[PDB]
Symmetry: none
Subunit: 339 residues, 4 copies
C-alpha cells in the first residue's frame, strides 16, 4: 500500500526528501507539509506538483489522520518537541539527525517511545546505508584481519558557510562518524577527546577551529582517530581505514568517473558535494523506512537509542572542545526494546 507522508520542515533537506519520495523512490506519497515559513511550504507543493495540504504548524499536521508517517526535517533544535508530539500519535517517524540537540532531550524521547506498543522512530544517520562502508564492515566481520585495533578516518569538506560554528564541527560534521563507529565496530565508546592542530588560514569564521582531531576510545580498546577538515578546499571526501591484528581494510576511492591521462599527470575527479557523495545512502535509507511502514513494521534503521548515544557523545565532544581534554563516556545498556 502507498505510504502517505507528512513533511515538517521544507528547506533544503526537506525538499530533497520530498523529491526522493515523489520522484525517485517507490511506495510513498507526500500528502501534507508544514514549515514556519509558510511560503516555503507552499513553494514545495508547487515545485514538486504535490497533492498535499499545507498546515500552518506541526501540531495541525499531526492531527491529519490520513498520514501514515512524518518526516522531521526542521532545524535540529526543533526536532525534540516535534518528535515528542508525534509520539502521541500512531504515526511512524523519520527524523533527520540529530534526534535532539541535548542528551536530555534525547532521553526524553527514548523514555517516551519506550511506553509505546512499537518502535516507530528512525533517525537519519545515512552512513550506515552507504554501500562502500557497509561492504567494509561486512568484510571486517568475517574475521579476516582479526580484531580491530585502530580506526583512522577523515571527514573532508571544501568550505563552510558564514554561520558554521566551532560546535558544528561536532554536531553537523563529526556526528556522522560518532554514529558510524560504534556500529562499525559493534562496540561502545568510553571516551572522546578533541584537539586543535594549527589553524588553517582558510577559515573565515570567528571561533571556528579547523582542522580538528577527534580521538575516541571503545570498551574493547580500539582507538579511533578522525580528522575533521571543513575548509580543505580540494573536495568532499570520506575516508576509512581499519587496522587489524593481521591485516588492514580501507575504503576505496569514491567515484565512477574516468581516469584521465593529460598534461603530465594521471588523474581522477574528486566530488565537491556532500550531496552527490551520499545520494545512494539517502535513497536506500528512506526506501527502507517506507518499506517498513508499508508493512506496519518497526523501522530497522538507526533508532532513538542510536540518537541518544550520538547526543551523549556529541555533548562530550563539545565539552572537550573547551579545553582539549578527554571526556569520559558511559552509556547505559541497550534496552531490549532497542535490540
Amino acid at each position: 500500500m502507498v505510504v502517505k507522508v507528512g513533511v515538517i520542515g521544507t528547506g533544503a533537506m526537506g525538499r530533497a526528501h520530498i523529491d526522493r519520495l515523489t520522484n525517485v523512490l517507490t511506495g510513498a506519497e507526500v500528502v501534507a507539509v508544514t514549515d514556519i515559513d509558510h511560503e516555503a511550504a507552499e513553494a514545495a507543493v508547487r515545485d514538486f506538483h504535490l497533492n498535499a495540504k499545507v498546515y500552518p504548524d506541526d501540531t495541525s499536521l499531526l492531527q491529519d489522520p490520513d498520514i501514515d508517517a512524518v518526516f522531521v526535517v526542521s532545524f535540529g533544535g526543533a526536532h525534540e518537541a516535534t518528535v515528542l508530539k508525534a509520539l502521541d500519535t500512531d504515526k511512524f517517524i523519520f527524523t533527520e539527525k540529530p534526534l535532539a540537540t541535548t542528551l536530555e532531550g534525547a532521553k526524553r524521547i527514548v523514555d517516551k517511545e519506550l511506553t509505546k506498543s512499537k518502535k516507530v522512530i528512525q533517525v537519519g544517520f545515512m552512513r550506515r546505508y552507504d554501500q562502500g562502508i557497509r561492504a567494509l564492515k561486512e568484510k571486517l566481520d568475517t574475521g579476516i584481519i582479526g580484531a580491530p585495533l585502530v580506526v583512522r578516518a577523515s571527514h573532508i569538506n571544501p568550505n563552510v558557510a558564514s554561520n558554521y560554528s566551532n560546535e558544528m564541527a561536532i554536531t553537523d560534521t563529526l556526528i556522522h562518524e560518532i554514529d558510524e563507529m560504534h556500529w562499525l565496530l559493534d562496540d561502545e565508546y568510553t571516551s572522546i577527546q578533541i584537539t586543535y592542530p594549527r589553524q588553517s588560514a582558510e577559515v573565515r569564521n570567528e571561533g571556528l577551529h579547523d582542522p580538528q582531531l577527534a580521538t575516541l576510545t571503545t570498551k574493547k580498546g580500539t582507538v579511533i582517530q578522525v580528522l575533521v577538515h571543513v575548509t580543505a578546499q580540494y573536495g568532499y571526501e570520506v575516508k576509512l581505514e581499519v587496522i587489524g591484528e593481521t591485516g588492514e581494510l580501507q575504503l576505496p576511492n569514491y567515484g565512477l568517473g574516468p581516469i584521465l591521462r593529460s598534461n603530465a599527470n594521471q588523474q581522477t575527479a574528486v566530488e565537491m558535494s556532500w550531496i552527490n557523495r551520499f545520494i545512494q545512502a539517502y535513497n536506500t535509507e528512506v526506501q527502507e523506512f517506507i518499506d517498513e511502514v508499508a508493512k506496519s513494521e518497526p523501522p530497522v534503521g538507526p533508532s532513538a537509542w542510536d540518537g541518544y548515544i550520538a547526543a551523549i557523545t556529541a555533548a562530550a565532544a563539545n565539552r572537550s572542545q573547551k579545553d582539549q581534554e578527554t571526556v569520559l563516556i558511559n552509556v547505559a545498556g541497550t534496552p531490549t526494546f532497542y535490540q
Copy 2:
C-alpha cells in the same frame, strides 16, 4: 499517471524487469503478462504479488486497452514478430536486445515503425546508462583529450554455459560493444574483422573459439580493438580505453568493496556476475523509458535504428567469423524520424 505495463516473456530477465518495475522503480505497474510457458507467467504474478491478468499469448495481451507499454523479454528469435504485432497498437515498446535476430528482421521493424506518427520503440542496450561508461563519454566530449583515434576495450566473462556458440561471442557478448562504440564516438562503422588467437584450453563448447579479437573501423578513422574472452575464469570485467590526440581516458576498476591488506598482498574483489555489474544501468534504463511513457513522449534511449545498426554489424561479424576476413559495413543514413 502510473504507467501500466504488460510483460511478454517472464523468464530470467522478464522477472528481473517485473521486479524492477514493481519493487525498485517508480511510476509503473505490471498489469499483464504472457509467456509460452503459461505456468511461468502465473508464477510471476504470484511471485511479485501482481494485480495482473495472464494472457495466453502476445496478441491477446496486446488487445488490452489499459496497457500503456509492453516489455518484450522473450527468446531473441521471438522479438521480431512480437515487436511487429505491438506496432499495430499504439503502445510504447521496450524490447530487450536484440531488436531482431536477423538484419532483415530489424529492417522490417524500422520500416514499420517509420509508418507511425511517432517513435515508440526502445531497445535494451543498457551500456549507455552505466554511470562509468557515461562519465567517460562525457569527459571525452569535453574535448580534453582531443579527437579519439583508437579505442581499446575488453569484455571478459569467467565461463559460459553449454548452449554458448561461436556466434554468440558476437550476438550475446560483443553486441554490447557493437552498440556502445558508435554512440561513444558519434560515428559510424565501416568494417569489422574477427580474428582468432590461440585457442584457450578452458573452452568446453563445441565450435567455440575463445578468445576472439574484434577490430572495427569507423568513418572518421578511429580503430576499435575489442578483446572478447568468455572463459577467462577470473571474473566478469568490462574495460574501456580511449586514446586521444592529447591524452587518454579509461574506466576505473568497478566495485565498492574494500581494499584488503593481508598475506603479503593488497587486493580487491572482482565481480563474477554480469548481472551484478549492470544493476544500475538496468534500473536507469528502465526508469527512463517509464518516465517517457508517463509523458506520452517518445523514448530517448537506443532505438530501432540502433537495433538495426547492431544487427547489421553483428551479421558482418558472424560473416567474418567464418574466415577471419574483413567485412565492410555501410549503414544507411539515419532517417529523420530517428534523428
Copy 3:
C-alpha cells in the same frame, strides 16, 4: 680493471650513458668522445667533468688503442657503419638499439661479427632488464594464469624531434616491443601487420603516421597488439598486459611522485621521458656490459643476433607500412656463435 670507454654520439642518450658511467656505475671511465656536432661532444666532456679526448670522427676514436670499449649512441641510421668499423678493432661494443635501420645492415653486422674469434657486441634492448617487466615475466612463467593467449601493449611518447621519420616508428620505437615479446613469451614471430588509425592532428613531421597499430603473431599463436603513439602529448609510458587462460597480468603504473589532492582532482605525475622511467634498466644493462669487458669476456646481454632477429621483424613492419598488409616472418635458427 677500470674499463676505458669511448662514446660515439653525445646527444640525449649519449649524455645519459656518460652520466651513469661516470657518476653511478662502477668500474668505468669515459676517456674519449666524438659527435658529428663537435660542440655537443665538447659539452659532454665539460658537463660531466671528464678527462676525455674529443675526436673528430668515429674512425679516429676507434684507432686509439687505450680504449677498451665503445658505446654507439648516435642516430639509429648511423649505427651500422660505426659498428662495422669497430669490428675492425678488438674493442668491445655496446650499441644502442636499433642494431641497424635495415635488415641488410643488421645482417652485415652479424656476418662480420661471426668472422671473429669472440663475440663483442651488446645491443641496448634494456626492457629485458627492467625489474617490473622481469617480475611480470617471472609470474607468467609460474603458470598462475595459464598459457598466454593475447598480449596488449602500449608505447607512448609525448612528442618527437624533427628528424623522426615514419620508418622510425618501427626502427626506433616498436623495436623495443619486437625484442621484448619474443623474450617475454619465449616464442618467435610468424607475422606482423601495421595499420594506420585516424591520423593525429598533433603530428608535425612530414610523412609520419601516428598513431600506429602493430599486430604480431607467434608460433604458439599468441597475438600481440601494440599501440605506438609518439605524439601523445601527455607523457611517456610503457604498458603491458598479458591475457592468459585463467587470469591476467599487468604492469603497474610507474611513479615515485606523490598523490596530490587539489582542485577537485586526485593526481600523480607521469614521466615525460625514457631517461628516468628506465634508469634502472639502463644502469643494469650497462653495468653488466662493463663487468664483462673487465674480464675480457663476451657480453651476455642481447646480441647482434637478437638485433638481427628484431631487424627482420622490423623490416617486415616497414614493408607492412606501405599497404597495411600482413607480412610473414620466419627467422633462422641461432648460430652456434650466438648461443
Copy 4:
C-alpha cells in the same frame, strides 16, 4: 681517486655497508675493519675479498692515516665512544643511527664536533634519501597545498624477533619518523605523546605494546599522528600523508610487481622486508657521503645535530611510554655550524 674506508662493526648492517662500498657503489674501498668478534671481522675480509687490515680495536683503526673515513656500525650503545674517539682524528665519520643511546651522549658528540674546523659526521637516517619521500617533500615545499596542518603516517612491520622490546618501538622503529618529520616540515618539535590502543594478540614479546600511537607537535602547530604496528602480519609498509590548507599529499603505492587478476580478485604483492624497501635509500645515502669525502667537503646528509634531535625526542618518547603522558620537547636553536 678512491675514498679509503674503515669499518667498525662487521655485523649484519656492517656487512651490508661493506657490500655497498665494495660491490654496489662507486668510488670507495674498504681497507680496514674491526669487530669485537674478531672472527666476524675476519669473515668480512674473506667473504667480500677485501684487501684490508683487521685491526684489534677501534682505537688502533683510527690511527691508520691512510683511512679517509670511518663507518660506525657497532651496537648502538657503542657508537658514542667510538664517535668521540674518531673525532680526535680528522677523518670523516658515517655512523649508523643512533648517534648515541642517550641524549647526554649525543650532546657530548655535538659539543666535540663544534670545536672542530668543519663538520665530519653523517648519521644514517636513510628515509631522507628515499625517492618517494623526497619527492613528496619537494612537492610540499612548492606551496601547492599551502601550509601543513596535520601529518598522518604509518610504520607497519609484519613481525619481530624475540629480542624486540617496548623501547625498540621507539629506538628502532619510530626513530625513522622522528628524524623524518622535522626535516619534512622544516620545523621543530614541541612535544611527543605515546598512547597504547588495545594490545594485539599477535604480540609474543614480554613488555611490548603493539600497536602504538605517537603524537608529535611542532612549533608552528602541525600535529603528526604516527601509527606504529610491528606485528601487523601482512607486510612491511611506510605510509605518509600531509594535510595542507588547500590540499593533501601522500606517498604512492609502492612496488613494481605485477597486478594479478585471478580467482575473483585483483592483487599486488606487498613488500615483506624493510631491507628491500629501503635498498635504494641506503645506496643513495652512502654514495652521497662518499662523494662528499671524495671532494674533501663536509657531508650534507643528516648531521650530529640531527642525531641529537632524534636522541632527545626518543628519550621523551621512552618517557611517555611509561604513563602515556605528553612529554615536552625544547630543542635548542641550531648552531650555525649545522646549516
